[PDB]
């Protein structure tokens, strides 16, 4: 469902349209018992509209020109997005950072409510990996071995550490070459490129623009698949077999098809 | 002010870009130079083995440097060791390869400088340049009994040591105590062997000096890029604080003017 | 037990490797080396240094100049200007340089220095002719 | 006290690139190496 | 500037309504607001003198609403609405490159892309002084012809690679052959984009000259003679090889057969040139 | 965060009164204000909506007295007053590790020492990321 | 106001000083990493260093215009290139005393002329060299 508070609307309409979409999502949570998704785009324009409304009302602005009620205006909206005993509302909010300043009052107030972070990097997209989520810059508060599990946490930390080692070794490879630490760093760079390919995934909503059928990977298939790459159980497969395939069974099936076609 | 921080942040950002570019170039040269040093080190071990076996103990001084400066503490510390030679052998003529050593040492001991080689450093050191220096020592006719070569040894990636390799003359070789144990010695054999052992020691130092110089320049640009990166981060936070303070202060002035009406 | 340090500005061949026999063409005569040799030193000349290791393997290394030193501790330090195996050499190229050297000798005339250079290249060319055709 | 070259644009001595406009000591280094080269030429 | 502040505030809306006449009648209009910075100053003057509550930089709280309700009227109408269009080119003057100032921040958020101009690039000879790395167009290559999209995609990729290794090109002469090729190609493409004033060129001329840039046809020429090559080779293909231009116009792209014909024409011309 | 700014302003003083019950009755209490930087934001909202003159970072001039009158009630009492005590652990959130900002410098001048937590140490896996050289206990 | 606010003797020596300080400003940066300098450049660097130490002055001791002109004239004509900068102040007191009770005719000559003639310049240089020999 869309609510579309447009830019050519007065600041009162743009300040309240996040509450309008939140009200629709609250019905699906309370009166249906669902886990609802709420998309706010943009959360900075919600802050910007509230600053314009307070300026119109004659209130004295706070630091960096924002409204004096900035934390309360954000807090009143963001505290309705939670899990209740009926259902939940999960909010994915597009974020604009003014002047590339994370200490600005608008992102600093927004970051106090976030439980995760999904960074879409154009550098990942230039490598052909879609979705272009940065594997290291994307964070989450629930990435702890008490909310998601011990195997989930250990595999995620191992994947992050492998990719951090790849980033630290990329300049060494660029200067000297692939010949480094015999076959130890060669094993690390081989696994890390397999990790980067296996993070890519075809999407069902884009299956008519790309031709690849989309995949919906369950969480256990993801953990099992990345555990296999981390354990080195698939070192005999090409890195192309890990690209744009959801499950790890798709990887070995694609590698078999390559071996049969070769 | 906000303009002063913005100007300084722009300058430090350009400094980091230059030093990162210099670090990549100097790492490429160091990788190539260490690759050839991996084979040209036992070449100097075999050349110095004879002088080690004779145990001859010590004029002329060979200084190895380059016209390319700002590689760290190479020419400064080598010249400092050369200054210690000027306080130990004030009457020793010195043959320099590089203008930087000439610049440092001309003010102190311009009366004890034999010759200074220039237009060197940009090209990699090969044997022909070593033979050019070797022919320069011979045909000049300058008297020398003992001697040494000043060069930057390659201890590690971040550490370089300034040592000296002793170089003797044909006349000193004939007068050696343990040279009687070596046979088949006449004038022409000793003369040709000495003037080729000299061109093998000079080639060994030139490979050691080039690798040590590129390694020092690589780690100096690496330190400069890290320090410029840290200074960028602190100046960015200072710029963000100053930008926010300017906006807040300007608005309070407007509010105070509006409320006073 | 004979430590071999045959190196070059271009390549490196042996580093303290036990060799049964190395025959060296020097200015003091094209003599040969066995372990615990005579303490001496000599100047290389254009010729075919040969290597005969502990397995009896025969390897031919033509050089253009250099130095040869044998110390009292059975340590052999042969350093040569450009040591290459002779298999990557051409006898036709050897005679081409030799004919070019002969032209330099004939066209030297009163240029005694150029006459010496022609003689030097004649010695190198004749050395390679025997090297490549053998 | 004379406004040394490279100490800063509008700060007594300087004018030029980003380093010279920022001043400090790197602008002094830029002015030192440049004036040394052109004094050697003359 | 001699006109009153209400007249300067009302002029963009008056011109927009004149352009909306063409939009609603099935025609296509282009509107230039030169410039919206001074219109916001005029609106700020009226608001401050009407005792309306000032905000950041003393601008009223509805100055974003002032420019958004103006610039949202530039639309591409549907075919059931006549198919007309209205294209807006607002102009914003920034102070010392501060695009984070209040009025430039608003108009950047409203618009569908920016064309950044710098004085540093202006005096380097880059005229028009467009910063390629900063200027965006959110509609992308959907607003280009097939021939232009074919060649500008490779030009954008090559110019991005040139800006990545632009630090080495300042001093590095003993680099690898690939890096030297990347910087030499980017110099040709940077010199290619330079254009004089009051002389716009047709899309066929633009595609042809940047086709020669990205296909290596300019790697053998000096950058100082690129402009002379731009005009003289255009004359050489406008009245001597018109059949190639006919095939490109008929098919809307450059086939490999037409690519080979253009390669022979360039090689023959560069022999003469 | 959904509560009104006067409620967030009042809550440190309400909890302090509940802790001062144990202090004045011979018992010992520990109180944590998590966090006082958000209470200063709530008090700045109340001050700006009361047309009071903003100062540094738009804060009112009595934002120091806001925290000073609160934290001074945490004290160790003598044996003639029962011997009880109240221990305060205020929390202050900085921006990019800036302890030189207005509000954290006010609380540092009030409290008896600070425990500084580093983002750089927290990224490296050091937990708790306590800066040993920058942590003071007066 | 410029040179119109200076007397004729001061204007003659401050104009030459402003040129020399400009030349010194061009060559003062060489102490950062330079090691070898031209002989004329070294003389410019030495004279400008003397001039920078000449502009230093203690508190509560203002000196007369004739003393300022004479000391600046010695600074810009190379009369202090052979003197260490640490003893410039001692020279500034003692040499001014020497030309006060003994060469007061020269001071009267400069006061009546109002400037520095080449003959008076030669006379002052000879007194400087005589004083430096006695120094």
DSSP labels, B42-74? HHHHHHHHHHHHHT----EEEEE--S---SSSH
Q: Kindly give the residue spans of alpha helices, DSSP state H, lying in G34-87.
A: 39-55, 65-76
User: What is the spatial distance between Cα C88 and Cα C59, in angstroms, rounded to a whole number?
Assistant: 13
| Contact list, C40 vs chain B (CB under 8 Å) | 182-185
Distances (CA, A) of B107 to B92, B118, D42, G41: 16, 18, 21, 14
What is d(CA B241, CA F101) in angstroms, rounded to the nearest whole number? 9
- B128 at E interface, C-beta within 8 A: no
From the list G24, G33, G38, the residue facing D32 with the nearest CB is: G33
Report d(CA A204, CA A211) in Å as an integer: 10
Inter-residue contact F39 to F5 (CB < 8 Å): no
Residues in chain E: 273
Task: Quote the crossing angle between the two packed helices A248-261 and A219-230, to the nearest 10°.
Answer: 60
End-to-end CA distance of chain E: 52
- Alpha carbon E20 to its chain's center: 24
- Please indicate whether, in this complex, the C-beta atoms of B20 and E56 are within 8 angstroms of each other: no
CA Rg value for chain E: 23
Resolution reading in Å: 2.6
Q: How many residues does chain F have?
A: 138
DSSP E58: G
Residue A144: strand, helix, or coil: coil
Clarify whether E242 is annotated catalytic. Answer: no
Q: Which residues in chain C touch residue B189, judged by CB atoms under 8 angstroms apart? A: 27-28, 41-43
Which contacts qualify for G68-72: CB closer than 8 Å, 24 or more apart? G68/G10, G69/G9, G69/G10, G69/G13, G70/G96, G70/G99, G70/G124, G71/G96, G72/G10, G72/G13, G72/G14, G72/G17
Neighbours of chain B (3+ CB pairs under 8 A): A, C, D, E, F, G
Quick one: which of E8, B113, D22, A235 has its CA closest to D13?
D22
Q: H-helix or E-strand containing A196?
A: helix A184-199
CB A41 within 8 Å of CB A59: no
The rounded distance, in Å, linking the Cα atoms of E243 and E261 is 10
* Omega of the bond leading into G62 within 30 degrees of 0 (cis): no
Q: Which chains touch A (3 or more CB pairs under 8 A)?
A: B, E, F
Category of A172 on φ-ψ map: left (φ > 0), alpha (ψ -120 to 50) or beta: alpha
Q: Which residues on adjacent β-strands are paired with residue C75? A: C3
Calpha distance E156→A170 (Å, rounded)? 25
* Three-state DSSP class for residue A231: coil
**Nearest in space to F110 (alpha carbons), one of F55, F73, F79, F78:** F73
Report helix, strand or coil for B249. helix
- Return the residue in A26, A75, A145, A158 with the most chain F beta carbons within 10 A, the one to mutate for interface testing: A75
Q: Smallest Cβ distance to D36: which of G21, G30, G55?
A: G30
How far, in whole angstroms, is CA B32 from its chain's centroid?
A: 16
Residues forming a β-bridge with E76: E85
Three-class SS string for A161-192?
HHHHHHHHHHHHHHHCCCCCCCCHHHHHHHHH
> Cβ contact (<8 Å) for A61 and F96?
no
Half-sphere exposure of E197 (CA within 13 A, CB side): 4
How far CA B257 is from CA of A12, B252, E48, E61, F44, in Å, comes to 27, 9, 11, 18, 21
Chain B closest CA to D37's CA: distance in Å? 13
Instruction: Determine the Cα–Cα distance for residues E129 and E127; give it in Å rounded to an integer.
Output: 5
| Cβ(G14)–Cβ(G6) below 8 Å | yes
Instruction: Determine contact, residues G114/G8, Cβ cutoff 8 Å.
Output: yes
3-state SS class at C42: strand
Distances D30 to A247, B218, D14, G15 between C-alpha atoms, Å: 59, 21, 10, 28
Round to whole Å and give the CA distance between D29 and D35.
Answer: 10
Three-state SS for A37?
strand
Q: How far apart are CA D37 and CA C15, in angstroms?
A: 48
* CA angle (E179 as vertex; E129, B213 as ends), nearest 5: 115
Min distance G36 CA to chain B CA atoms (Å): 5
The span from the CA of B30 to the CA of B220, in Å, is 13
Which of the following is catalytic: E138, E146, E185, E215?
A: E138
Distances (CA, A) of B1 to A102, B243, D16, F101: 21, 9, 20, 17
As a whole number of angstroms, the distance between CA E118 and CA E126 comes to: 10
């Amino acid at each position: 469902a869309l609510v579309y508070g447009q830019m050519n609307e007065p600041p009162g309409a743009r300040a309240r349209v996040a509450l309008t979409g939140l009200t629709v999502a609250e019905y699906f949570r309370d009166q249906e018992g669902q886990d609802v998704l709420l998309f706010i785009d943009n959360i900075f324009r919600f802050t910007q509209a509230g600053s314009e409304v307070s300026a119109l009302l004659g209130r004295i602005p706070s630091a960096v020109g924002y409204q004096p009620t900035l934390a309360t205006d954000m807090g009143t909206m963001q505290e309705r997005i939670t899990t209740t005993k009926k259902g939940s509302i999960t909010s994915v909010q597009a974020i604009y950072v003014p002047a590339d300043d994370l200490t600005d009052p608008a992102p600093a107030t927004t970051f106090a409510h976030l439980d995760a972070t999904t960074v879409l990097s154009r550098a990942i997209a230039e490598l052909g990996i879609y979705p272009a989520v940065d594997p290291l810059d994307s964070t989450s508060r629930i990435l702890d071995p008490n909310i998601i599990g011990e195997e989930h946490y250990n595999i995620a930390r191992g994947v992050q550490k492998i990719l951090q080692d790849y980033k630290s070794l990329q300049d060494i490879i660029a200067i000297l070459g692939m010949d480094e630490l015999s076959e130890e760093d060669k094993l690390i760079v081989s696994r890390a490129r397999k990790i980067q390919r296996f993070l890519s995934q075809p999407f069902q909503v884009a299956e008519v623009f790309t031709g690849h059928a989309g995949k919906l990977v369950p969480i256990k298939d993801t953990i099992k698949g990345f555990k296999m790459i981390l354990n080195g159980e698939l070192d005999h497969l090409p890195e192309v077999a890990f690209y744009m395939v959801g499950p790890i069974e798709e990887v070995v099936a694609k590698a078999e098809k390559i071996a049969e076609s070769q | 002010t906000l303009k002063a921080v913005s100007i300084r942040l722009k300058s430090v950002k350009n400094i980091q870009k230059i030093t990162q570019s210099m670090k990549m170039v100097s790492a490429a040269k160091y990788t190539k130079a260490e690759r050839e040093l991996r084979v040209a080190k036992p070449y100097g071990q075999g050349a110095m083995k004879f002088y080690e076996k004779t145990e001859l103990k010590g004029q002329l001084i060979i200084a190895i440097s380059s016209d390319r400066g700002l590689c760290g503490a190479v020419h400064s510390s080598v010249g400092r060791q050369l200054k210690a030679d000027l306080a130990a052998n004030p009457d020793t003529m010195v043959i320099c390869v590089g203008d930087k050593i000439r610049n440092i040492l001309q003010r102190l001991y311009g009366n004890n400088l034999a010759m200074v080689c220039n237009d060197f450093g940009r090209r990699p050191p090969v044997f022909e340049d070593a033979t050019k220096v070797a022919r320069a020592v011979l045909e000049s006719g300058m008297e020398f009994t003992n001697g040494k070569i000043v060069y930057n040894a390659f201890r590690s990636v971040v550490s370089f040591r300034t040592t000296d390799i002793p170089v003797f003359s044909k006349n000193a070789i004939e007068s050696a105590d343990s040279i009687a144990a070596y046979d088949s010695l006449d004038s022409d054999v000793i003369q040709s062997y000495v003037e080729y052992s000299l061109a093998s020691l000079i080639y060994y130092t030139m490979k050691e000096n080039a690798t040590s110089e590129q390694s020092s320049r690589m780690t100096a640009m690496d330190n400069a890029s890290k320090n410029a990166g840290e200074m960028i981060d602190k100046l960015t936070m200072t710029f963000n604080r100053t930008r926010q303070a300017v906006i807040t202060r300007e608005l309070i002035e407007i509010i105070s003017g509006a409320s006073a009406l | 037990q004979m430590a071999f340090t045959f190196a070059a500005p271009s390549q490196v061949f042996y580093n303290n490797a036990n060799i049964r026999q190395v025959d060296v063409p020097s200015f003091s005569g094209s003599f040969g080396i066995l372990p615990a040799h005579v303490a001496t030193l000599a100047v290389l000349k254009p010729g075919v240094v040969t290597v005969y290791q502990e397995d009896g393997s025969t390897k031919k290394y033509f050089v253009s100049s250099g130095t040869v030193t044998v110390n009292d501790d059975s340590s052999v330090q042969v350093l040569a200007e450009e040591a290459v195996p002779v298999e990557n050499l051409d006898l036709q190229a050897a005679r081409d340089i030799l004919s070019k050297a002969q032209s330099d000798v004939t066209s030297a005339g009163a240029d005694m220095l150029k006459l010496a250079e022609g003689q030097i290249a004649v010695e190198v060319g004749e050395a390679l002719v025997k090297a490549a055709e053998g | 006290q004379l406004g040394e070259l490279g100490t800063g644009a509008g700060k007594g001595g300087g004018g030029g690139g980003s380093v010279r406009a920022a001043g400090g000591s790197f602008g002094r280094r830029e002015a030192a190496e440049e004036e040394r080269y052109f004094r050697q030429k003359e | 500037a001699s006109d009153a502040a209400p007249l300067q505030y009302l002029a963009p809306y008056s011109g927009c309504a004149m352009g909306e006449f063409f939009r609603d009648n099935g025609k296509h209009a282009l509107i230039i607001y030169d410039d919206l910075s001074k219109q916001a100053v005029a609106y700020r003057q009226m608001s401050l003198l009407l005792r309306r509550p000032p905000g950041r930089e003393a601008y009223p709280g509805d100055v974003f609403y002032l420019h958004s309700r103006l610039l949202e009227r530039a639309a591409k109408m549907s075919e059931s609405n006549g198919g007309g269009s209205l294209t807006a080119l607002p102009v914003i003057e920034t102070q010392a490159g501060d695009v984070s100032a209040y009025i430039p921040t608003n108009v950047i958020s409203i618009t569908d892309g920016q064309i950044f101009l710098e004085t540093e690039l202006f005096y380097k000879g880059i005229r028009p002084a467009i910063n390629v790395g900063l200027s965006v167009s959110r509609v992308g290559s959907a607003a280009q012809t097939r021939a232009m999209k074919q060649v500008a995609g490779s030009m954008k990729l090559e110019l991005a690679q040139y800006r990545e290794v632009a630090a080495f090109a300042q001093f590095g002469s003993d680099l690898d052959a690939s890096t030297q090729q990347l910087l030499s190609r980017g110099v040709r493409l940077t010199e290619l984009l330079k254009q004089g004033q009051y002389v716009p060129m047709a899309i066929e001329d633009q595609v042809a000259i940047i086709y020669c840039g990205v296909r290596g046809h300019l790697d053998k020429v000096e950058p100082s003679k690129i402009t002379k090559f731009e005009k003289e080779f255009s004359q050489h293909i406008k009245t001597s090889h018109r059949d190639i231009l006919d095939t490109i116009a008929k098919e809307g792209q450059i086939s490999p057969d037409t690519d080979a014909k253009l390669k022979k024409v360039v090689t023959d011309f560069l022999s003469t040139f």
